[PDB]
Design a protein around this ligand. Structure first.
Ligand SMILES: Nc1ncnc2c1ncn2[C@H]1C[C@H](O)[C@@H](COP(=O)(O)NP(=O)(O)OP(=O)(O)O)O1
Ligand SMILES: [Mg+2]
Ligand SMILES: [Mg+2]
Length: 431
DNA sequence: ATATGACGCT
DNA sequence: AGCGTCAT
């Protein structure tokens, strides 16, 4: 009762760009706008692999990881943009740079944690408090929330179109707001949503890109909220909406529960939905999933999560990687050394840019490879000192640290063949 | 035969 | 350190 914390201390948002690489390509090429479109990587094998899909093309069933030749079977008018290729590999610079455009705009409103190339969490607690002093108990007009959904509303006893439903739920939400209570969690969320509308308007105004957002009390709910009404909309998930929302929410939809841990929860406990977790004690959950996971699950199924928005807008590693599938697996020493060089040359370019831009230098080089037949992402990881941003030195050091993995008795030959090379610069210090 | 990035475990 | 997990 009086002493049970409810996880309502923060306002946290997750902003995620809508079909991000497609929007980047559509900005650059007006002929792709308002069309079924996808961004494709390489070309020779089955037309290349799709990595981003416009919402018009999703309506035909086109998805990420689909081959372009297969996507065209679903959607014959599909337009395609190709990822740039440099040094024989995909080169993602255009998207990294568009990401920086978005992150710098968001960083004007609050401290952000970059969570992917296209999304960032926002700790809005301070901004909300400041905005709540300036408002001075004035009601929040629905005009301030033109793209906001209130999860769980409209409800109860009292319209057959999407936007009408949205507005009816928003009116019900606003009409129940205690606007005199500067500490009401629901009011704080609402003001947070007002700020995220402003943030998303600025992103769209200054970049042309549209995005979605979730606003809630923690990162997990904000991320979940964000996807509820993609694209080009934001969703507020209140603490009070959690029981109904979680009562039919598959466990795998919750961030970090999408893999083996979430599958074990389902299998060991005999449950399907996040809300069913409330029936177990914290000790029970810890007994099955370990001390940290059990505690985390106990709170999370009640909508409570305390992972902070870390103040970090820049990645902390800089890495280059390429897979060599099937018959293209690297099978000679010279092949391995040539591709390590291509990777090292792109890495040097990104590192040199990183040092001038962000006043830091990497100090460790991590070399990861995958051998043919191994289902793991990485078969082997070794590291060495990164002392000079010099591609030939880096590629040579990388070969040095992996070269003993070659079981071939022949010098020119590499065995077992390599299906992935990966160079990652890490352990940055200020410069 | 689908390029990366963060963090956990021992 | 080197591998395992989850993610976009
Ligand atoms: N496995 C992957 N491999 C390569 N690139 C990927 C990728 N997953 C995502 N990307 C790249 C391409 C993606 O555009 C970008 C952001 O990924 P999302 O936010 O997960 N998906 P999007 O923003 O496209 O659409 P929406 O959010 O509206 O659903 O990262
Ligand atoms: Mg996205
Ligand atoms: Mg994303």
């Amino acid at each position: 009762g009086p002493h049970m914390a409810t996880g309502q201390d923060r306002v946290v948002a997750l902003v995620d760009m809508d079909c991000f690489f497609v929007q980047v390509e559509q900005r650059q090429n007006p002929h792709l706008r308002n069309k079924p479109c996808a961004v494709v990587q390489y070309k020779s094998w089955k037309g290349g692999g799709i990595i981003a899909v416009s919402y018009e093309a999703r309506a035909f069933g086109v998805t990420r990881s689909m081959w372009a030749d297969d996507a065209k079977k679903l959607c014959p008018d599909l337009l395609l943009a190709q990822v740039r290729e440099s040094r024989g590999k995909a080169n993602l610079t255009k998207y990294r740079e568009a990401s920086v455009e978005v992150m710098e705009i968001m960083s004007r409103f609050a401290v952000i944690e970059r969570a992917s190339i296209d999304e960032a969490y926002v700790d809005l607690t301070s901004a909300v408090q400041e905005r709540l002093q300036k408002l001075q108990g004035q009601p929040i007009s629905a005009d301030l929330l033109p793209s906001t959904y209130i999860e769980g509303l409209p409800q109860g006893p009292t319209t057959v179109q999407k936007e009408g439903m949205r507005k009816q739920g928003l009116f019900q939400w606003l009409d129940s707001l205690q606007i005199d209570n500067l500490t009401s969690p629901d009011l704080q969320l609402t003001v947070g949503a007002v700020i995220v509308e402003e943030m998303r308007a600025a992103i769209e105004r200054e970049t042309g890109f549209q995005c979605s957002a979730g606003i809630s009390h923690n990162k997990v709910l904000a991320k979940l909220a964000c996807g509820l009404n993609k694209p080009n909309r934001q969703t507020l998930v209140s603490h009070g909406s959690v029981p109904q929302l979680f009562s039919q929410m598959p466990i795998r939809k919750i961030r970090s529960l999408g893999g083996k841990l979430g599958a074990s929860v389902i299998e060991i406990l005999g449950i399907e939905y996040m809300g069913e977790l409330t029936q177990f004690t914290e000790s029970q959950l810890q007994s099955h999933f370990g001390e940290k996971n059990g505690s985390w699950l106990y709170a999370m199924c009640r909508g409570i999560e305390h992972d902070p928005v870390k103040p970090r807008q820049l990645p902390k590693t800089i890495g280059c990687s390429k897979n060599f599938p099937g018959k293209t697996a690297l099978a000679t020493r010279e092949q391995v050394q040539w591709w390590l060089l291509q990777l090292a040359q792109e890495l040097e370019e990104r590192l040199t840019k990183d040092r001038n831009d962000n006043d830091r230098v990497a100090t460790q080089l991590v070399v990861s490879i995958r051998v043919q037949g191994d289902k793991r992402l990485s078969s082997l990881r070794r590291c060495c000192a990164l002392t000079r941003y010099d591609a030939h030195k880096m590629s040579h050091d990388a070969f040095t640290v992996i070269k003993n993995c070659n079981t071939s008795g022949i010098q020119t030959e590499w065995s077992p063949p390599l299906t992935m090379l990966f160079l990652c610069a890490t352990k940055f210090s200020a410069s």
